[PDB]
Amino acid sequence: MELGELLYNKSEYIETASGNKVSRQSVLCGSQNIVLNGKTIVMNDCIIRGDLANVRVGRHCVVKSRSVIRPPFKKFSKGVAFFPLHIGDHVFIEEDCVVNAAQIGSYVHVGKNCVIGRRCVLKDCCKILDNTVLPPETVVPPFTVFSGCPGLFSGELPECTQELMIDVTKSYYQKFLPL
Amino acid sequence: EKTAVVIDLGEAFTKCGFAGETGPRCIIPSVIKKAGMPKPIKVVQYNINTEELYSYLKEFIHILYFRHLLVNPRDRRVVVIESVLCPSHFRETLTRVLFKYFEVPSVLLAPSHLMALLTLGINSAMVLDCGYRESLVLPIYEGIPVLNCWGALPLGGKALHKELETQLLEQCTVDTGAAKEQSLPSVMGSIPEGVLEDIKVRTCFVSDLTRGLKIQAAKFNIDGNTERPSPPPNVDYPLDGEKILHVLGSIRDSVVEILFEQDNEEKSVATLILDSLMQCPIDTRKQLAENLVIIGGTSMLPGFLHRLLAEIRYLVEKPKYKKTLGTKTFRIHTPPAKANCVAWLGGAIFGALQDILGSRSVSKEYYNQTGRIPDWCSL
Amino acid sequence: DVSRFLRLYLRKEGYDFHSSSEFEIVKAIKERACYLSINPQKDETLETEKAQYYLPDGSTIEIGPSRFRAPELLFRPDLIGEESEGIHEVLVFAIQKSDMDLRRTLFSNIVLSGGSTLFKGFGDRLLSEVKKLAPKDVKIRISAPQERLYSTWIGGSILASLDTFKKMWVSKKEYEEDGARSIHRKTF
Amino acid sequence: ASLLQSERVLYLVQGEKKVRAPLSQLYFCRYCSELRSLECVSHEVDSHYCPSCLENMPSAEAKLKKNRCANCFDCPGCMHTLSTRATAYYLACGFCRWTSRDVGMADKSVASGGWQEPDHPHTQRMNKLIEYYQQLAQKEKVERDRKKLARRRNYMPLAFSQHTKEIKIEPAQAVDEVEPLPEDYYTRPVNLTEVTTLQQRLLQPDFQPICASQLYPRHKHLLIKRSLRCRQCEHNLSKPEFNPTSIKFKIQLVAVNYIPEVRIMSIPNLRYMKESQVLLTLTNPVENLTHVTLLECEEGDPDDTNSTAKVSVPPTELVLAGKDAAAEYDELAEPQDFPDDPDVVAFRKANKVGVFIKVTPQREEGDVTVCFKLKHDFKNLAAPIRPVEEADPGAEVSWLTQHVELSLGP
Amino acid sequence: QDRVLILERQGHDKDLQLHQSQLELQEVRLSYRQLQXXXXXXXXXXXX
Amino acid sequence: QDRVLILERQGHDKDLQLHQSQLELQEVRLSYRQLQXXXXXXXXXXXX
Ligand SMILES: Nc1ncnc2c1ncn2[C@@H]1O[C@H](COP(=O)(O)OP(=O)(O)O)[C@@H](O)[C@H]1O
Ligand SMILES: Nc1ncnc2c1ncn2[C@@H]1O[C@H](COP(=O)(O)OP(=O)(O)O)[C@@H](O)[C@H]1O
Ligand SMILES: [Zn+2]
Ligand SMILES: [Zn+2]
Ligand SMILES: [Zn+2]
């Protein structure tokens, strides 16, 4: 709201360990294969399944409530297996959002309730708008905005994304405290 | 020298590409998606303030020169195709945008009708331009446009889109998907122009003269009991997903008739050729009649060229045109590119001529000095 | 033709008058606001006021440069592309075609008639355009009446009143007996 | 950028055209002293690339290939990048289940090399017309040159010497009767799936087909890498030669990376009166600033103004430390403690200072808008200096006034 | 004399090219100084 | 013609200047490309 990030008070129940905060409400079925190296946030009722995964997330990663990050299955003639996805640094997944994406780049703002397709690659410094469908096996270049049910080039982003996005994710993390 | 770019700014669609090519590289709706506005504003709009028009054209030309075409604007020349009697302030603005902001080397303001003639190769021909706003005709005799014997009527895309909207609202039968299996009239107050255009293209067609003449008298109901031909089957068209509009068979073949209807005045798209040709010089009559050209996307409508050429030969026998244009052989030219992209193709053929282009075209150095674009009005 | 050419220039200003009814209001626009500039080239370079005209519906239209460069086509019909002499030319040519002795008296007595002389600054332009074509140091008097539009009728009204008119006209019985020529031969 | 509403508080540009834009979008010009907008600055073309298979193509190859990738294809039905599937290869879409088999294109033995677009039907007639007009234009050039050098000479067409292969195109034959509309169209159900919409018709302009079976898939459109160059200044910013899979700038320049960015941290009540807290972070390592000015009286386009923001505060010296600092590491005396300013200054963290503005809302009905001028000490470094060799006191002394327009939520 | 005028025009066009190249030299040379700084930064960052 | 001869000699000298300037620009561009290759190596290290 007018550049400034607003207050969000968390409850007592949340798994805070080595900077990484993960809501107890949010199930993450397969805790072994999933890994959170940095000071990540995972909001309540969110899913990070371990269906033969290697879900590596960023330094300041944010996943809002009711949102799912599942790896896609690669339809290979040699052997059909689930491809391990790698969420980049400073990644912001918005609320109620579906992600079946392989290799999500750093410094990205994925919009609200937007379905990303199977085996979908996202390069760094991009932005997917809200109520948008990226089809299976699609690529989005840097400094781009993809939107619509087709999921196609809408326009370009501001030049200063790399520097700006840092402030957003770090401010949200700092502003997001217990009550 | 570099291959000069060709742009053709229209109300419905803009043609864009490079000179010495078989057709245009990009053809897109002439609109811009501004932040806040739900429906995108139209880039060409006649009779508005210059500053507001300048901003829209600046926004549009930017999209053409970077997103659609990929080339530096300052490097290579421009060939701006625009119809004769295009509003003064609009053409003045369009040039001022290209010369000031983009800093183009030189613009050439070619009339669409003379460009359409080059594509065929014939030096003299009659040219009808059934566009979005107005269906204009202009006789071209051996390179010289005859402005004396001009002709225009508002029987294009806009007039056809409006006629379709009116007819659909009368016989309105939509299946919303909320106990609306039964015929529900006018659930939506207005239908968006994007939908109406898609219905027109896919569903509606141009009827034969014999069947059309019956349709005219049928809807009139001039002291006759159900004297209409059997219509085509009713086509169901989806509106915004769930809502399914059942388009009546009568609407498909009646909507077009407003173009070819006489309406007492004796002013149709057909009559406009013969009205112009009768006003032409006596020596030029037989050459122009033999060489007819039908450009514009409105004439793409299926079975338009057959109805027009037939309606011509019927209106010839009518006593007004029977004396002068009685024993004349009307033959249509088939241009190499499609009816929509005839105008553009001429500018590309002209753009390929680097030697003549530089001389005829207005240089930026001249415009910066003078600030006076040459027109067919007095200097 | 001036009304027809004004409609074309009004479309070049961006106001269409396609309908036959809408042609009548172009004739009204012409009759209301259209001034003949003494020098046409100077008024074109000068920025116009764009004088607003009110239509029957109530809508306003800014005419601008179309106002003055429409009736110019009388004095210079080659501009649009009509092969004619021009209003200044036909007057001079008609005098020059006549015998040399009368030329001076015919220049000294010119009368403007009809409605297409009532254009604002018509007499001013014609005088200037005639002078340069006509011989040097010749007196040119263009005597316009106040009732130019109704001049042709008033002439007939006077002619009709005279007792000489009784002889001039052709009787109904004369037309039945004499034949078709009767009307033509008595004309003069 | 979008999550936080950067499209609210805007900075003004100086020149011919005045524009209100977010600082995120604007660029600072270092050659001179005047920030300019994406609109004001001139655009260039650097490199072309495919959005699917990120391959940097040269400018020459693009002109030959008509600004398209040979390997990648976009579907005609919906607008999405196609994928090669095997059984011996067919082209299929993920969003819609349109195949290359549907339209009736035969499967190729080789993956990429086999696929092609048919030649344009009126390509042979085209070249013949160009060559005819080229020869005919060349005659006019010689005539115009001969006429011009005769005028330049001014010899009155003096005959010193004796004065004074042809290409003839056949003009297209006019058909007596054009083909009528087929009698099928009368008394036949029209399937809207079979016939194509305008959008997908017009994407293939060379021979836009009514039927779907004719409509072939066009090559994927190449995208552009923009480089900005100003009117007064020369260079400004640009991009690398490997913009594909890179977020690095060859020359990073932006208004947020020089001019101190203002943000509305707290928003108070909108009912006729309130006290709004706004932050003023610095980007430069060591500098000084001040938000003293009240935007004069009816000067610098204050038409948007619908309130009277006092901001009656003297300059406050803030500095940025490009390092990972702890929560209250050290307390500096002269910077922080000396100008305590409890009423004026809300809080002073690292590269951060909150300031209370006394706004007067409900002067109009709604949509509260405030105009205020912000000053800053711009270390321009216009003169030649290697790692701040020159003192740059006159540069630092220069006070640059940016007319800011903050828009409260209302 | 036509050859003289044409050769003068050729020299003038070459001088225009030279001036454009000089403007590009200045602008892209400030760019190259920035890139030199960037290359130093890149070596340091490679170490880091 | 003698004046034009002086102009033509100066034009040839300026063409030599153009050759030198273009050579310097191309060489600096090649050096920057090598630096960018080094940067790409650094980026590979960073990816690792
Ligand atoms: N391929 C087509 N088939 C049928 N109708 C078309 C086609 N292309 C365009 N049209 C219709 O005809 C019109 C043509 O307008 P156009 O000539 O492109 O614009 P302008 O006259 O402004 O230059 C469009 O508005 C559309 O309604
Ligand atoms: N006040 C006026 N100013 C300008 N033009 C006028 C004016 N009054 C009439 N006209 C023009 O002159 C025409 C009238 O011609 P008129 O004198 O009636 O011809 P006639 O002599 O054949 O009866 C009008 O139709 C109009 O075009
Ligand atoms: Zn500058
Ligand atoms: Zn590709
Ligand atoms: Zn598709």
Author numbering:
A (entry chain V): 1 to 179
B (entry chain J): 12 to 390
C (entry chain I): 189 to 376
D (entry chain Y): 2 to 88, 106 to 182, 219 to 464
E (entry chain x), F (entry chain X): 290 to 337
Please, what does the article write about this entry?
We performed signal subtraction on the TDR and TDH datasets individually to focus on the pointed end, which slightly improved the density around the cargo adaptor interaction sites compared with previous maps (Urnavicius et al, 2018). The majority of pointed end interactions cluster around four sites. Site 1 involves the disordered loop following the long helix in p62. It is shared by all three adaptors, with the loop appearing to adopt different conformations to bind each adaptor. BICDR1 contacts sites 2 and 4. In our TDR structure, we previously estimated the registry of the BICDR1 coiled coil using density for the sole tryptophan (Trp166) (Urnavicius et al, 2018). This positions a series of negatively charged glutamates near the first half of the loop in p62, suggesting an interaction between the cargo adaptor and site 1 at this point. Extending our registry suggests that the positively charged site 1 loop on the pointed end binds to a negatively charged patch on BICDR1. Further along the adaptor, our model positions the BICDR1 Spindly box near a prominent kink in the adaptor (Urnavicius et al, 2018) and close to site 4 on p25.
